[PDB]
Amino acid sequence: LLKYNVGDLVWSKVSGYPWWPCMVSADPLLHSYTKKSARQYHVQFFGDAPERAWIFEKSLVAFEGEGQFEKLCQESAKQAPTKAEKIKLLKPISGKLRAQWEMGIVQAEEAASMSVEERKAKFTFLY
């Protein structure tokens, strides 16, 4: 009865950032993963340097594979507010961030490779 559940795997768009591979998790504080018309969820960003955050359900799609990446970039930059984001949301990733994104997908598909119960166990991170 919810578009996503605990260990589901999702692309997450944050303004300034490229749509990003994430797994949903429980907030290590509130001990929930979701919470008036639009829903949020708790998701941790894949990277060699992971982080977490509450994203809206609206900036959230389920993750089939690395295939969806270019088309999702098209959709967001289809029209983004500034037109220097669009420029940069459409040339392939640059800089410090790039190496981490590559690390992102590797984990992502390695993680689709496994059932929730172990994918959670191996991929929810502690701080």
Side-chain angles (χ1 to χ4, degrees):
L1 162 83
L2 296 187
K3 206 188 300 199
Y4 305 75
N5 221 26
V6 199
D8 301 2
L9 284 81
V10 297
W11 288 100
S12 311
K13 187 61 173 89
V14 178
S15 181
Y17 298 86
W19 280 78
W20 203 277
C22 304
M23 194 186 68
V24 175
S25 62
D27 196 356
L29 216 167
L30 305 175
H31 311 329
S32 73
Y33 81 107
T34 184
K35 46 190 183 184
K36 298 160 293 176
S37 324
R39 193 158 281 280
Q40 291 183 309
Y41 290 105
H42 184 262
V43 301
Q44 61 162 54
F45 292 74
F46 285 96
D48 61 340
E51 317 270 323
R52 56 173 180 93
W54 286 86
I55 313 291
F56 285 111
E57 186 178 7
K58 94 152 161 83
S59 297
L60 222 63
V61 307
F63 173 88
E64 301 317 308
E66 187 212 340
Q68 310 173 304
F69 175 77
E70 219 89 81
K71 60 184 69 178
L72 290 178
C73 302
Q74 290 175 347
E75 292 315 313
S76 60
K78 199 150 257 174
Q79 221 67 39
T82 181
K83 319 178 177 182
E85 185 175 19
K86 306 164 56 58
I87 297 163
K88 184 178 189 303
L89 192 53
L90 288 177
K91 45 174 77 177
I93 316 171
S94 77
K96 34 179 175 309
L97 198 141
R98 167 176 175 86
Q100 297 180 346
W101 195 84
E102 303 185 352
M103 282 293 316
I105 291 293
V106 181
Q107 305 175 332
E109 296 281 342
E110 188 192 336
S113 209
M114 31 185 108
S115 79
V116 289
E117 196 252 348
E118 51 164 296
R119 154 171 64 210
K120 301 197 292 190
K122 201 172 160 66
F123 282 106
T124 318
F125 293 125
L126 275 50
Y127 299 94

